[PDB]
Amino acid sequence: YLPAQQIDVQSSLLSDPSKVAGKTYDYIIAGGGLTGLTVAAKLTENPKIKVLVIEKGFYESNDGAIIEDPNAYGQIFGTTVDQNYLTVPLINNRTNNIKAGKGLGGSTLINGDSWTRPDKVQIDSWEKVFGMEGWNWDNMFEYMKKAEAARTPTAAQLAAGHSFNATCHGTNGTVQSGARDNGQPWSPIMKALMNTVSALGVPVQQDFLCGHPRGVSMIMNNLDENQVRVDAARAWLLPNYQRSNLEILTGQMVGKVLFKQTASGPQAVGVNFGTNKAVNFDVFAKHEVLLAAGSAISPLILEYSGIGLKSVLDQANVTQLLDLPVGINMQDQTTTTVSSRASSAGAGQGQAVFFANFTETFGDYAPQARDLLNTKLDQWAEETVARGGFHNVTALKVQYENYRNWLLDEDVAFAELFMDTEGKINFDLWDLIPFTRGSVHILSSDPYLWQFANDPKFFLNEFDLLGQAAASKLARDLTSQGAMKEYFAGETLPGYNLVQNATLSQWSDYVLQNFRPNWHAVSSCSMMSRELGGVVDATAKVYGTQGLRVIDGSIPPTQVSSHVMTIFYGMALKVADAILDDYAKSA
Amino acid sequence: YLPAQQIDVQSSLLSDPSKVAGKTYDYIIAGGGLTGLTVAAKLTENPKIKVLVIEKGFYESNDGAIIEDPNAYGQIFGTTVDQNYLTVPLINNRTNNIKAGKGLGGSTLINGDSWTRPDKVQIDSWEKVFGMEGWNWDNMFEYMKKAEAARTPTAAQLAAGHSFNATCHGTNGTVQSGARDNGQPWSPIMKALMNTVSALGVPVQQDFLCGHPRGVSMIMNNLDENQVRVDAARAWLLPNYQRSNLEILTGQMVGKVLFKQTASGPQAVGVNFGTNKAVNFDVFAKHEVLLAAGSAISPLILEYSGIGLKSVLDQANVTQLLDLPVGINMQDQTTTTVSSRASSAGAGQGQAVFFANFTETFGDYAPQARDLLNTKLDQWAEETVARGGFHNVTALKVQYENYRNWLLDEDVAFAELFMDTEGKINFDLWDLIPFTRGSVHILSSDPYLWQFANDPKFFLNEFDLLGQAAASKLARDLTSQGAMKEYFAGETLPGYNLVQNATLSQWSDYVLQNFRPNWHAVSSCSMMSRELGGVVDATAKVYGTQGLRVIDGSIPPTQVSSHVMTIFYGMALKVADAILDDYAKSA
Ligand SMILES: *[C@@H]1O[C@H](CO)[C@@H](O[C@@H]2O[C@H](CO)[C@@H](O[C@@H]3O[C@H](CO)[C@@H](O)[C@H](O[C@H]4O[C@H](CO)[C@@H](O)[C@H](O)[C@@H]4O[C@H]4O[C@H](CO)[C@@H](O)[C@H](O)[C@@H]4O)[C@@H]3O)[C@H](O)[C@H]2NC(C)=O)[C@H](O)[C@H]1NC(C)=O
Ligand SMILES: *[C@@H]1O[C@H](CO)[C@@H](O[C@@H]2O[C@H](CO)[C@@H](O[C@@H]3O[C@H](CO)[C@@H](O)[C@H](O[C@H]4O[C@H](CO)[C@@H](O)[C@H](O)[C@@H]4O[C@H]4O[C@H](CO)[C@@H](O)[C@H](O)[C@@H]4O)[C@@H]3O)[C@H](O)[C@H]2NC(C)=O)[C@H](O)[C@H]1NC(C)=O
Ligand SMILES: Cc1cc2nc3c(=O)[nH]c(=O)nc-3n(C[C@H](O)[C@H](O)[C@H](O)COP(=O)(O)OP(=O)(O)OC[C@H]3O[C@@H](n4cnc5c(N)ncnc54)[C@H](O)[C@@H]3O)c2cc1C
Ligand SMILES: Cc1cc2nc3c(=O)[nH]c(=O)nc-3n(C[C@H](O)[C@H](O)[C@H](O)COP(=O)(O)OP(=O)(O)OC[C@H]3O[C@@H](n4cnc5c(N)ncnc54)[C@H](O)[C@@H]3O)c2cc1C
Ligand SMILES: *[C@@H]1O[C@H](CO)[C@@H](O[C@@H]2O[C@H](CO)[C@@H](O)[C@H](O)[C@H]2NC(C)=O)[C@H](O)[C@H]1NC(C)=O
Ligand SMILES: *[C@@H]1O[C@H](CO)[C@@H](O[C@@H]2O[C@H](CO)[C@@H](O)[C@H](O)[C@H]2NC(C)=O)[C@H](O)[C@H]1NC(C)=O
Ligand SMILES: *[C@@H]1O[C@H](CO)[C@@H](O)[C@H](O)[C@H]1NC(C)=O
Ligand SMILES: *[C@@H]1O[C@H](CO)[C@@H](O)[C@H](O)[C@H]1NC(C)=O
Ligand SMILES: *[C@@H]1O[C@H](CO)[C@@H](O)[C@H](O)[C@H]1NC(C)=O
Ligand SMILES: *[C@@H]1O[C@H](CO)[C@@H](O)[C@H](O)[C@H]1NC(C)=O
């Protein structure tokens, strides 16, 4: 990594709210994150469309290594670029922190840069199970390829374990992708891990952009040729910020959507934005207001605007405009870490990802886990609804059956074991397919206080705890197994904190105390049929409203066995097309 | 509590940075918290003194119950009024959150409202040991009384356990103080606790405003007659915000102090403030720049400005202007909670505080603890300096000896067991007098990124851990002892998480995993002689600089066996007098 030249984009953007207050744009986008900027860029390709992006943070892509270098991952946490949202006290009786980016590019500023794609069956379920017409793998694959420009791996990258299936990578898109390569010798552990699991009959070197992410592979990252993080601002704003029809207001928060009443429901006419209950401004949209503030916030903006569950709104003292199941169905994953020291021979760079299916994760407990899936769905659905994770047991059962189908019938990756080397055998791992459903709701009426109860309800579903415990056990087992054993130089985490012969039950206890949110919450404004409990339709329009869409990570109706940037970019592009279709239909 | 109609002070304050950018004020106060507002109010009593307060947050005193009602304590955590600073990963390998207020009044907006005063010997040591002229109990007692307007407890409050030594309470000051009374029947547990410890020879009903806070008493709160939290904005800004010479810029952060080089060192000439590396402005001070951004932030502002330890500034890429031990010596306390359910008879409202001295805290381990204090000071001092908590072992040993003196010779309260009732026997407790010394340093040069390493170094000193373990055991033991037993309905925390017969060693392991910061960090810019490692002198001037003072919680050179609002108000008043003395000397 070399700190190259960075355009000071911020100095050409707006930071004075009085410059936009009371103005009228075609579209107002709340949140200049992944989806917000993608859509902003696509909308402003048409010179007649004036778009205002209101972003809480600022331009941070020129911050140097802490943002630009993928290898500095994590150092930005705790800075002003980290939203650092606080959850309610979780199952272990501690609040947890939600990492999320604050600044143009949102969480793409601070993420791990892992570039993989969901399983075809997961995206197909959006159309086939959730009724979202056109949201299927074939369509999304095209949009996902359209978003990226992949570079093929070098010889050393291939030898380290990379495997590139050229049919799955777009080569002409906006977001560059390629193998992370920090200049260090390649650790042999990625290959060792592949050799270990391939001896168990686990697929290896499947290209994770191809539709069936399974087994152990090295992955692409969203890095340019200079190994610079291609956050969404760099990809979509940097090239386009001089467009006169694209206005970016930084340092300001959208608090609520402004509506006018029509015969066909509330029509969004603008937003109230600002920084405080007494420092806020109205700004108007001729066409639509697009919420792209991230899955933790977009539901809140709706609730602050009077759209949400009456029970939530009443408690918050917000007059209800529309009853919609906003802020429920939220699905984040639980992450645990199993870390071991690698021998000197195992030193070097490299990450490998193991997308373990149901049986690989559960191993000898597979039969028992299968029995639970086959018999407890109704009970789990009832309990999830009872704790406020969802509102319609029948509709939730559909989701559970969908996940069950994936896990037992479709060989979908259940757990992701993310291995980092750099002198260790470090596994960050998470059960990808939670049965728990969480909630994210406002607690009071002033949007600028941002008083919310963000409750992912981790491990309130027993299967998620078992799944995480089994995945964690698997990481430990894999580390001192087969070819991996050669490089194993002692476990440090849990290390002495958990007996080496730990059973699934002991791992469960350990995991309950030592997990963190995966910070990949989705489905807080679920895009699914209204009858299934959706908040937004297939064009991301909030049901019962006009001129209002939620276009971010709040809308995926399911978790995916993948890193979400790819699908979110594809989703943002698809939604931009829908918005533009509507624009064209108004003359 | 009853929500009354509140004045919208925010609308009369500044939120546009362009309105102050480039102006010259007499004084610029970075941080409109407890000390910042107190000083700003005192300085602007003189109509010719133009003061600018730059506050990161806004006016929040009219937010309703979440701020105004002391009984809503903690609901504000996680909102925009909570700084929610992240520490580095602590001894338990978890980062922890630092609650701190963000808005006019700072942490007085979100605090527990406990109004108690330090021990006379602790304040006397500032002058006697640390060499800070005029900083002694007699002087501070008067200043502390001048800040407050106390109400005597009612008959019911007295019968519940209140006790007042009228000679210690100011009755004409600005911050009202009185018994919290939420209208509920008084729990009998405060009296039961007093009866329990009084059987053991522990003092009860000592007035904790009188100089020797010891034993179990009920305490005053900073509440007006309407039971409204008297935060510092309410007390000092609300009455005075129409002053034409008092300008408050909200929503902006001071990032660094601007200096002009003189013969006698750097002269502060103003500050750079704003919200981002590319969105910031300069504003100038004719007289002085006063840092009052809180003990977690003032040291950082100095470091961002080039004042601090070379090793820190080099790592952060900040050119050093002055080498001073900024951001070390930091002392926060560790808090643990021992919570038990109370029988129905113990129901009701009421808080009681046990200021436990050394022997009461350690009980049977007293002899062993005393041995540690008598023999390990030098070792601890070396180890504290080695881990970066301080820079001069000899000077640190002075602090250690001072603390040892307090504990062993002066009967100073060593641990505070803060009891809440309301259906429980809930003890939040902390060792008040830490031997550990933490650090708080910038990690990079952009102030607006706020990339820092806030490291309280909790439990890196063995005595602190022992002290916290012993205090925690004491809380458990007291709960089911003597008169307390009647109301004891079973422990819930640690409850099953720690065996009921837990030894001190088992408590230590427990405490290590289950503690939180007390959020009372002081001494990050210690007010002590330069030779002892001071950052500011007895008039709060940063050594080696002109026109620059640190006037907040960063400056107390020692922890105090008390809630700090009282002493911080007293300190701010004393510092205001020092500032005005200098103002007068410049014509
Ligand atoms: C906070 O986090 C830090 C950092 O992670 C924790 O500190 C690390 O703690 C781990 C232990 O949990 C420790 O790892 C040991 O390192 C030793 C080298 O100094 C190794 O000898 C040791 O290996 C043995 O134990 C492993 C774990 O059980 C086995 O996997 C391994 O094969 C080894 O087992 C052999 O030896 C043991 C002797 O204990 C014997 O009983 C076995 O049967 C077998 O013969 C560990 O790998 C790290 O060195 C620590 N330090 C750092 C910086 O990493 C700290 O514990 C955490 N604190 C809390 C409160 O959680
Ligand atoms: C997260 O926090 C929640 C909330 O605090 C935790 O849930 C609470 O957990 C505690 C236990 O740790 C539990 O308290 C028990 O409640 C029971 C009633 O429901 C009581 O019967 C029980 O009392 C016995 O145990 C206490 C603790 O040891 C003793 O102090 C007490 O005297 C009792 O012990 C006597 O009785 C038993 C048999 O009854 C005997 O064997 C003993 O030797 C002795 O004679 C506890 O008070 C709370 O009910 C839980 N729930 C709530 C809502 O508070 C949760 O565990 C935490 N989660 C994690 C992961 O840490
Ligand atoms: C720690 C972490 C690691 C991750 N690692 C990976 C990875 O390795 N691979 C991967 O593919 N994905 C990863 N992700 C996920 C990916 O970054 C997110 O899914 C993606 O950025 C979500 O896009 P979005 O548009 O939904 O929201 P975001 O990108 O979060 O953007 C939302 C934007 O809204 C702004 N905002 C918030 N509130 C308001 C308001 N009230 N008004 C105006 N603006 C507001 C925020 O500042 C932000 O810029 C990671 C995310 C995190 C947090
Ligand atoms: C959770 C909690 C509970 C507490 N309970 C009690 C109690 O019960 N009794 C008691 O006596 N004390 C209590 N305190 C302690 C008391 O509230 C604090 O000690 C006191 O407010 C510290 O005053 P200060 O002036 O140092 O800083 P603060 O009051 O914190 O004020 C600092 C101010 O600076 C602002 N600021 C921060 N960074 C910047 C920047 N870069 N530029 C401009 N402004 C900035 C902050 O927004 C804030 O308003 C508690 C504190 C906390 C956090
Ligand atoms: C999960 O993938 C495994 C491959 O790793 C699938 O195949 C079975 O693998 C298990 C152990 O890994 C073996 O016991 C079986 O013998 C394998 N099958 C055959 C035909 O050999 C397994 O089917 C996948 N699970 C699901 C639910 O799809
Ligand atoms: C801690 O306070 C205890 C009281 O709980 C002190 O003990 C009393 O000390 C006085 C002497 O000043 C004696 O007259 C009493 O008989 C003592 N006995 C007890 C156990 O009550 C104790 O001295 C204090 N400890 C320190 C270190 O000051
Ligand atoms: C290659 O990609 C195609 C889709 O284009 C997919 O069908 C096939 O399974 C992929 N193979 C591997 C090994 O990734
Ligand atoms: C509950 O969800 C099921 C499945 O979508 C649906 O058939 C039913 O209409 C929903 N119930 C109501 C009353 O909406
Ligand atoms: C009463 O307060 C005075 C200080 O004003 C103090 O000197 C005296 O000791 C106090 N009395 C008791 C009993 O604490
Ligand atoms: C170390 O501290 C001691 C005690 O204050 C002092 O005498 C000595 O001068 C200090 N520092 C230096 C620079 O040596």
Same domain, B252 and B334: no
Same domain, B122 and B195: yes
Same domain, A68 and A51: no
Task: Establish if B154 belongs to a structural domain.
Answer: yes
> Locate tokens 């603390």: which residue?
B403
Task: Give the three-class secondary structure for B27.
Answer: strand
DSSP B354: E
β-bridge partners, A418: A353, A428
Residues A483, A344: Cα–Cα separation, whole Å: 15
β-bridge partners, B86: B97
Task: Establish if A343 belongs to a structural domain.
Answer: yes
Task: Establish if A3 belongs to a structural domain.
Answer: no
Residues of B in contact with A59 (CB under 8 A): 276, 278
Same domain, A506 and A565: yes
Polymer length of chain B: 587
Helix ranges restricted to H, B32-89 = 34-43, 65-68
Same domain, B482 and B359: yes
- How do beta strands A51-55 and A24-30 pair? parallel
The C-alpha angle B2, B4, B5, rounded to 5 degrees, equals: 160
Task: Establish if B1 belongs to a structural domain.
Answer: no
Assess contact for A34 and A572: CB atoms under 8 A.
yes
**CA separation, residue A207 to residues A117, A118, A158 (Å):** 9, 11, 12
User: Which of A6, A15, A102, A496 should be substituted to probe chain B, the one whose Cβ sees the most B Cβ atoms within 10 Å?
Assistant: A15
DSSP B388: T
Provide the 10 A C-beta neighbour count for residue B489: 16
CA dihedral A60, A66, A70, A72 (to 10 degrees): -160
Residue A68: CA atoms inside 13 Å, Cβ hemisphere, count? 17
Task: Give the three-class secondary structure for B196.
Answer: helix
Residues A241, A247: Cα–Cα separation, whole Å: 8
Mark which of A239, A267, A292 sits at the end of a domain.
A239
- How do beta strands B51-55 and B24-30 pair? parallel
Kindly give, in sequence order, each residue whose CB lies less than 8 Å from that of residue B260, ignoring residues fewer than 6 positions away: B266, B267, B269
Provide the 10 A C-beta neighbour count for residue A184: 13
Assess contact for B38 and B51: CB atoms under 8 A.
no
The range of the structural domain enclosing residue A368 comes to 114-221+329-438+456-522+558-574
- Let me know how many helices (H) and strands (E) chain A has, helices first: 16, 23
**Is B360 labelled a binding residue?**
no
Same domain, B104 and B157: no
Q: Which of B177, B563, B565, B575 to mutate to test the pocket of ligand 4 (most atoms within 8 A of CB)?
A: B565
Task: Establish if B91 belongs to a structural domain.
Answer: no
CATH assignment of the domain containing B109: 4.10.450.10
Assess contact for A382 and A392: CB atoms under 8 A.
no
| Binding site membership of A491 for ligand 1 (Cβ less than 6 Å) | yes
CATH assignment of the domain containing B364: 3.30.560.10
CATH assignment of the domain containing A22: 3.50.50.60
For the question of residue B287 being annotated catalytic, the response is: no
Same domain, B547 and B471: no
B228 — phi, psi (to 5°)? -100, 135
Residues A36, A569: Cα–Cα separation, whole Å: 10
Kindly give, in sequence order, each residue whose CB lies less than 8 Å from that of residue A386, ignoring residues fewer than 6 positions away: none
Same domain, B492 and B471: yes
CA dihedral B297, B302, B304, B310 (to 10 degrees): -120
**CA separation, residue B50 to residues A285, B23, B45 (Å):** 42, 11, 10
Kindly give, in sequence order, each residue whose CB lies less than 8 Å from that of residue A64, ignoring residues fewer than 6 positions away: A3, A6, B444
Assess contact for B204 and B339: CB atoms under 8 A.
no
Of A10, A63, A279, Cβ closest to residue B15: A279
Residues B529, B526: Cα–Cα separation, whole Å: 9
User: Which of B279, B338, B426 should be substituted to probe chain A, the one whose Cβ sees the most A Cβ atoms within 10 Å?
Assistant: B279
Q: How deeply is A151 buried, as exposed, middle or buried, from its count of CB atoms within 10 A (0-12, 13-18, 19+)?
A: middle
**Is B114 labelled a binding residue?**
yes
Kindly give, in sequence order, each residue whose CB lies less than 8 Å from that of residue A40, ignoring residues fewer than 6 positions away: A29, A32, A51, A53, A236, A237, A246, A248
Residues B422, B418: Cα–Cα separation, whole Å: 13
- Let me know how many helices (H) and strands (E) chain B has, helices first: 17, 23
Same domain, A408 and A284: no
Task: Establish if A2 belongs to a structural domain.
Answer: no
Same domain, A103 and A166: no
Position A362, amino acid? F
Same domain, A275 and A259: yes
Residues of the binding site of A for FAD: 34-35, 55, 83, 103, 107, 111-112, 114, 254, 553, 565
Residues A527, A523: Cα–Cα separation, whole Å: 7
Residues of B in contact with A450 (CB under 8 A): 79-80
Residue B543 corresponds to which tokens in the numbers above?
A: 């050594």
Task: Establish if B334 belongs to a structural domain.
Answer: yes
Task: Establish if A401 belongs to a structural domain.
Answer: yes
Elucidated via: X-ray
β-bridge partners, B254: B273
Residues B265, B539: Cα–Cα separation, whole Å: 17
Kindly give, in sequence order, each residue whose CB lies less than 8 Å from that of residue B184, ignoring residues fewer than 6 positions away: B348, B349, B422
| Interchain pair A80, B448: CB under 8 A | yes
DSSP, residue by residue, A134-149: T-SHHHHHHHHHHHEE
Residues B389, B87: Cα–Cα separation, whole Å: 15
Number of domains in chain A: 3
The C-alpha angle A423, A74, A11, rounded to 5 degrees, equals: 135
Mark which of A239, A268, A283 sits at the end of a domain.
A239
Of A8, A82, A85, Cβ closest to residue B278: A8
Residue B516 corresponds to which tokens in the numbers above?
A: 């939180």
Residue A574 corresponds to which tokens in the numbers above?
A: 């698809």
Nearest to B66 by CA among A576, A191, A316: A316
Assess contact for A27 and A289: CB atoms under 8 A.
yes
Assess contact for B222 and B176: CB atoms under 8 A.
yes
Residues B532, B535: Cα–Cα separation, whole Å: 9
β-bridge partners, B118: none
Task: Give the three-class secondary structure for A560.
Answer: coil
Kindly give, in sequence order, each residue whose CB lies less than 8 Å from that of residue A313, ignoring residues fewer than 6 positions away: A303, A306, A319, A320, A442
| Interchain pair A278, B59: CB under 8 A | yes
Nearest to B556 by CA among B548, B566, B546: B566
**Which residues of A belong to the active site?**
520
Resolution in A: 1.8
Interface of A with B (CB under 8 A): 8, 10-11, 15-16, 18, 58-59, 63-64, 66, 75-82, 84-86, 94-95, 97, 250-251, 275-279, 443-444, 446, 448-452
Mark which of B208, B239, B270 sits at the end of a domain.
B239
Of A58, A76, A277, Cβ closest to residue B276: A58
Same domain, A478 and A569: yes
